[PDB]
């Protein structure tokens, strides 16, 4: 039984560019404006939650988390996903760093480990 | 749908009608969609006439708040679906 | 090719159409509810609609209790609902046997949230078709109505409405909740909430209701549990007397 | 011709059929005559083996799972092996864990639930072979007709194979008569003869054209070919 | 000794809507003005496709004309001796309602020869030639 | 796009599932079978269809047993079927092995759907196309429910499926209209008889065989076995009389 | 279908209020049930609670022919009026039949 | 009306004139087919006679009930049940006009002369009263919007 579905979903398209990076890209450009700028003595990240109906609570919905306390994400994307992915996010900077150096990674080596998930789902089938 | 485009054309179709004192426009015109010439005086057509429904010769706040939720309520689009964005 | 709106991949406007046609699966029972949050309990009230008369009215509801405290109303078709109380209530158990702790209403929200996200991500498998409405009574919070759906966007509602009439019931109760100002109902007792909840439906769906029409769930201070015909038939003799 | 909705087995026609399905019992009506019967105390199939030319042999249409059961023919060859093998497992886990020889029904209910795993899951294919399973237990003597649908049913006699359910009118004919036939085998397989012989339409039966078995109380399982079967022709 | 009116599947692709059912109307008319008639309706995998929906309403105006043919074949009024030859190289694509007898009962299977038939083809193909004997 | 319906997850644009559609559509073309809820217990009923006469007559059954008080009457695809309530046999084994207490009627429900809506969840497996009629008696009293391929189970008072499905319902809602305050188990025999002749005069051009039986504390004590003997004859000739 | 509408047909000012009649809920089957079953001769006390129950996404012309159903199904038994146990029949007739229509969608403009 | 080609005055009055394919359709010979040469269905013709035939010849009886007769019957099934040759032994059977038509004849070259067909089609069947239309292959026209 199990998974079926062991090919590849992004194939090259024969102009040579992937179609799923380049429609991912499109579902992105759409959506909520977020934006953040580095100062010398400081980072400032900035996001708009879009309150879908009057009668929801933004509160309890968190458009920036905690990665780690020096750490923030914010996303301009979709919602599940995000979540999903800063959950896996946490997980995989505990196990490689709290687990094994007692600290938490800088921002340098994190972006890349978390971005590993994205590139390696691009890729699994 | 600018802001100062809606309050003009809101002002203008008012000044004709009898828009009651303690009535605000710009309560009504507090969120910014893409609202047309047209549908924003049908609107207004609706409120008067869901003010006459309930005998009252002058119309009040409560029917032109009630009058945004009939005449414009979505374009569906993907607005229906609040995990795109 | 044409292979896209099958599966859950993106499309040339960005979009997850097989996700989008999921949203229109929770509307084949058209049951409306509505739970409103209470000043220290929750009450949720959905349609009971019994087609036929073979029909046993006790076993036919869309209202579970996940745990003693934790209750949960779902719109949709009735075995992925099933399913998806069954995973929640698994859920629950292992949370509390891990933790040693009842979980609050968010957490629980959160984890089904996740496993509609990993649903959909995955080709293989296929979203679920219902939209569930998880409440509670949060010592550590405050009372809670949490609404997931089918792709996983969930968020913690004043006041929840569904069904086909979810629009309708939404601006009716909104205009009160705009001129009232406040985040939820005032009325200290579990008794006056229902009555509130239940004219507000009628006056929504316009229809009159019945000792069998519709199925209420009470969500108390750790205490949940759906009432009985009776009492929602002395409820009703009650609000007609009142108005 | 095939259909859009052919593809795999796991599929359903709008109609509300499975075309796999479909094709393994066109498969098995495609096959050989091997009509069987059976009586309250013993049970006979008879077996009409093909060549393929005049310097060629015969397949073994009647294959023996154990002393108090038998098979038989109506189709894929290669197939019959893996049945034959399942259900000689399961006699032989009877006889090792149970004692009790195993049920005809219950062989039925194992072969029908084998049957299906291939047809209920993506990656497998239903086999299209035509089993008549034959035993005697301490009920009585017992007769099945498998399918490749998973539909197994017990009859006093049948007839799976090509044209051989045109042979079926002669077992409904006299199928009044052979039940009260206790304790005369030779007759019994005699009947039976004449059964298959209402299939024949090109060539008669021979020494190296039948195929016989039979079992009872007094009689266990027992495969006549060769001059041995040319007494009953 | 029979008419034997040709059609090629093509033909009967026109351009305003409806054109095709009047085609084969207009077909079948002349046939059976005549006292014995053969039609010879080829590559009908042009005009054959199985009915089905798309929500744009894909290539309906075929599917217009292969109905109104499925009608003149077999309608509420007899043939009248218009016995009709098909020819296709996909006979998979073509609607079901075409294959039922009544208006087409026996399906040819034109395959590939045997060694025997490769024999005989060369002999009819090289009854001319200037072969070497032996 | 076409081919909504090749796959199984997939959602058609109206969110209404198409391979389960099609199993349900196949579930009809079997033979009927009835299931009355007396007030003691439950009484199944079918109606196994007798071919050419080769077919040995009370010989094939269609009631299987699961455990002792838990009957499965299934139409349909037969073989489906089996292998579903060989299922049930293992989980119903499984339950009493590791709790030692027969496993009750609705949990046996709980676990027959989730596992029929397992497979209609991928795309590498075949929905069943088996309708059940199973129930029976348990600590809390007598359950009916009716099965349906999608997943969906109900707490029936009465329950049919088959050629005549409809016709057995009709006879169903007039025998509840007759008997509100309840049915015996004895009288209950001779009224799933007499509605499976109604039912069958569909199906009047092939012969009929009929099998009942019941599982009832009041005679059985929570035993479910055949009806044999004297009375299925009286059932059959009473049944016969009012024709 | 108000979808496949031209936008500038559907504009507020050429087309006014936009009345939309949806499919009759409960209490409205109630009265369609009064309505078309009042010519038919009686004969019972036609408590339609169980078709009003039943007749669920039931739309309009369906409850007529309900009731043409039922007066069908009188003439089957050769009776010369309907039975309250034969409106049942038909009411269940129509809703087998209700699947093989398209499960009717549509958006509030 | 029949006028003068010059005087134009009005000559005399004419009959309502149809399409002239629409007076084409309307059967002229019954097919001798009757209901003992269609075998199998007997639930089906019961139904269809009872709902098209009956409220034709015995009315009254629908009349005195106070209910209306149905307007049509669908014939929906898999190709080669006999769909076409019952209608086929109705029109054998009944007495009324039976105005046959293909869906795909109703399909035409401009526009709107299709609805000038099939609405003149229905002012015929109005003119020669009862009658049984029997659009066939309805999946021709009958495709979702
Ligand atoms: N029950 C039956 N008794 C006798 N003949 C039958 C029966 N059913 C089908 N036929 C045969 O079917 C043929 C006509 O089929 P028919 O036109 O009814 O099929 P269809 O699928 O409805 O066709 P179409 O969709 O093209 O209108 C005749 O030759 C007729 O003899
Ligand atoms: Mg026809």
Redesign the pocket.
């Given at each position: 039984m199990t998974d079926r579905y062991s090919f590849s979903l992004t194939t090259f398209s024969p102009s040579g560019k992937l179609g799923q990076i380049d429609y991912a890209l499109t579902a992105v450009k759409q959506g909520v404006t977020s934006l953040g700028i580095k100062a010398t003595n400081g980072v400032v990240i900035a996001t708009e939650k879009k309150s879908s109906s009057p009668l929801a609570m933004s509160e309890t919905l968190s458009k920036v988390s905690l990665l780690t306390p020096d750490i923030g994400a914010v996303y301009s994307g979709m919602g599940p996903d995000y979540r999903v992915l800063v959950d896996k996010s946490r997980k995989v900077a505990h196990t490689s760093y709290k687990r094994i150096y007692g600290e938490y990674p800088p921002t340098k080596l994190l972006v890349s480990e978390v971005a590993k998930i994205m590139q390696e789902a691009t890729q699994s089938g | 749908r600018d802001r100062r485009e809606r309050r003009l054309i809101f002002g203008t179709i008012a000044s004709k009608m009898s828009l009651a004192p303690e009535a605000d426009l710009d309560s009504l015109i507090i969120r910014n969609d893409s609202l047309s010439g047209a549908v924003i005086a049908a609107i207004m057509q609706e409120a008067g006439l869901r003010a006459v429904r309930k005998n009252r010769y002058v119309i009040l706040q409560s029917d032109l708040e009630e009058a945004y939720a009939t005449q414009v309520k979505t374009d569906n689009t993907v607005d229906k679906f609040d995990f795109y964005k | 090719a044409g292979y896209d709106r099958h599966i859950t991949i993106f499309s040339p406007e960005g979009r997850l159409y097989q996700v989008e046609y999921a949203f229109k699966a929770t509307n084949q029972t058209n049951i409306n509810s509505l739970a409103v949050r209470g000043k220290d309990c929750t009450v949720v009230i959905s349609q009971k609609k019994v087609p036929d008369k073979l029909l046993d009215p006790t076993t036919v509801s869309y209202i579970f209790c996940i745990s003693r405290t934790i209750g949960m109303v779902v719109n949709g078709p009735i075995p992925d609902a099933r399913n998806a109380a069954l995973r929640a209530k698994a859920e629950a158990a292992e949370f509390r046997y891990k933790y040693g702790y009842d979980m609050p209403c968010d957490v629980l929200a959160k984890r089904m949230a996740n496993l509609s996200q990993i649903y959909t991500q995955r080709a293989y498998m296929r979203p679920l078709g219902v939209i569930l409405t998880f409440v509670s009574v949060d010592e550590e919070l405050g009372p809670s109505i949490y609404k997931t759906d089918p792709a996983g966007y969930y968020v913690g509602y004043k006041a929840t409405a569904t069904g086909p009439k979810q629009q309708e019931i939404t601006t009716n109760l909104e205009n009160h909740f705009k001129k009232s100002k406040i985040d939820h109902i005032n009325e200290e007792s579990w008794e006056k909430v229902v009555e509130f909840a239940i004219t507000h439906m009628i006056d929504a769906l316009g229809t009159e209701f019945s000792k069998n029409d519709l199925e209420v769930g009470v969500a108390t201070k750790d205490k949940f549990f759906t009432l009985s015909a009776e009492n929602i038939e002395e409820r009703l003799v009650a609000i007609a007397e009142q108005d | 011709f095939r259909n859009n909705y052919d593809g795999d087995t796991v599929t359903f026609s709008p109609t509300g059929r499975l075309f796999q399905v479909e094709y393994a019992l066109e498969a098995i009506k495609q096959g050989s005559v091997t009509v069987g019967l059976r009586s309250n105390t013993h049970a006979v199939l008879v077996a009409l083996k093909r060549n393929a030319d005049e310097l060629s042999s015969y397949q073994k249409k009647i294959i023996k799972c154990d002393e108090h059961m038998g098979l038989s023919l109506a189709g894929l060859a290669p197939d019959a092996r893996v049945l034959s093998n399942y259900l000689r497992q399961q006699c032989n886990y009877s006889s090792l864990v149970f004692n009790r020889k195993l049920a005809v029904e219950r062989a039925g209910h194992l072969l029908c639930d084998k049957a299906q795993k291939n047809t209920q899951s993506y990656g497998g294919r239903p086999y299209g072979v035509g089993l008549l399973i034959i035993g005697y237990d301490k009920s009585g003597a017992h007769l099945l007709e498998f399918q490749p649908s998973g539909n197994v049913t017990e009859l006093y006699g049948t007839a799976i194979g090509a044209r051989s359910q045109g042979a079926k009118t002669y077992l409904e004919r006299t199928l009044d008569t052979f039940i009260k036939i206790d304790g005369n085998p030779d007759e019994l397989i005699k009947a039976g003869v004449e059964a298959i012989s209402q299939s024949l339409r090109d060539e008669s039966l021979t020494v190296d054209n039948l195929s016989i078995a039979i079992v009872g109380k007094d009689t266990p399982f027992t495969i006549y070919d060769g001059e041995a079967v040319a007494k009953y022709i | 000794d029979a008419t034997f009116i040709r059609v090629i599947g093509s033909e009967l692709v026109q351009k305003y809507v409806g054109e095709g059912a009047r085609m084969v109307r207009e077909l079948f008319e002349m046939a059976r003005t005549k006292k014995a008639c053969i039609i010879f309706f080829d590559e009908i995998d042009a005009v054959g496709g199985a009915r089905f929906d798309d929500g744009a309403g894909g290539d309906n105006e075929v599917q217009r004309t292969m109905l109104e043919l499925?009608?003149q074949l077999?309608?509420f009024d007899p043939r009248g001796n218009i016995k009709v030859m098909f020819a296709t190289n996909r006979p998979n694509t073509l609607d079901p309602?075409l294959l039922?007898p009544?208006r087409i009962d026996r399906k040819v299977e034109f395959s590939l020869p045997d060694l025997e038939g490769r024999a005989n083809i060369f002999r009819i193909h090289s009854k001319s030639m200037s072969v070497e004997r032996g | 796009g076409t081919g909504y319906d090749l796959s199984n997850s997939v959602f058609s644009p109206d969110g209404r599932n198409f391979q389960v559609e099609y199993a349900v559509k196949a579930v009809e073309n079997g033979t009927t079978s009835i299931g009355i809820k007396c007030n003691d217990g439950v009484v199944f009923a079918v109606e196994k269809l007798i071919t050419s006469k080769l077919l040995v007559p009370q010989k094939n059954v269609k009631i299987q047993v699961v455990d002792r008080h838990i009957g499965c009457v299934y139409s349909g695809l037969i073989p489906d079927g089996r292998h579903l309530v060989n299922r049930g046999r293992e989980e119903a084994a499984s339950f009493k092995k590791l709790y030692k207490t027969p496993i009750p009627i609705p949990a046996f429900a709980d676990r027959l759907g989730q596992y029929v809506q397992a497979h209609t969840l991928y795309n590498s497996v075949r929905p069943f196309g088996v309708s059940t009629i199973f129930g029976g008696v348990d600590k809390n009293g007598a359950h009916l429910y009716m099965l349906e391929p999608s997943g969906s189970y109900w707490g029936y008072k009465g329950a049919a499926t088959g050629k005549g499905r409809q016709s057995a319902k009709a006879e169903l809602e007039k025998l509840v209209d007759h008997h509100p305050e309840g049915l015996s188990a004895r009288e209950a025999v001779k009224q799933a008889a007499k509605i499976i002749y109604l039912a069958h005069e569909d199906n009047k051009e092939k012969d009929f065989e009929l099998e009942i039986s019941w599982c009832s504390l009041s005679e059985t004590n929570g035993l479910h076995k055949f009806v044999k003997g004297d009375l299925l004859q009286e059932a059959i000739d009473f049944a016969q009389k009012e024709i | 279908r108000p979808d496949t509408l031209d936008p500038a047909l559907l504009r507020p000012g050429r087309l006014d209020r936009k009345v939309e009649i949806p499919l009759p809920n409960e209490a409205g089957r109630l009265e369609i049930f009064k309505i078309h079953t009042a010519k038919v001769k009686k004969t019972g006390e036609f408590d339609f609670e169980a078709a009003v129950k039943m007749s669920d996404g039931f739309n309009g012309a369906d409850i007529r022919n309900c009731a043409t159903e039922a007066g069908f199904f009188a003439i089957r038994d050769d009776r010369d009026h309907i039975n309250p146990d034969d409106l049942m029949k038909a009411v269940r007739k129509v809703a087998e039949v209700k699947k093989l229509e398209g499960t009717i969608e549509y958006q509030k403009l | 009306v029949g006028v003068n080609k010059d005087s134009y005055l009005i000559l005399d009055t004419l009959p309502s004139e149809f399409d002239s394919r629409v007076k084409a359709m309307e059967v002229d010979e019954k097919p001798t087919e009757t209901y003992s040469?269609?075998?199998?269905?007997d639930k089906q013709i019961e139904e269809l006679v009872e709902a098209i035939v009956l409220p034709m010849k015995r009315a009254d009886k629908f009349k005195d009930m106070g209910i209306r007769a149905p307007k049509g019957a669908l014939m929906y099934?898999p190709?080669?049940?006999?769909?076409?040759?019952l209608a086929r032994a109705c029109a054998a059977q009944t007495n009324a006009t039976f105005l046959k038509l293909a869906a795909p004849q109703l399909v035409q070259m401009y526009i709107g002369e299709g609805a000038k067909l099939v609405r003149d089609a229905f002012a015929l069947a109005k003119e020669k009263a009862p009658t049984i239309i029997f659009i066939?292959?309805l999946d021709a026209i009958g495709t979702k919007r």
């Open positions: - | - | - | - | 499925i009608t077999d309608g309602a039922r009544g | - | - | 040469d269609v075998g199998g269905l099934g190709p080669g049940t006999g769909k076409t040759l066939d292959e």
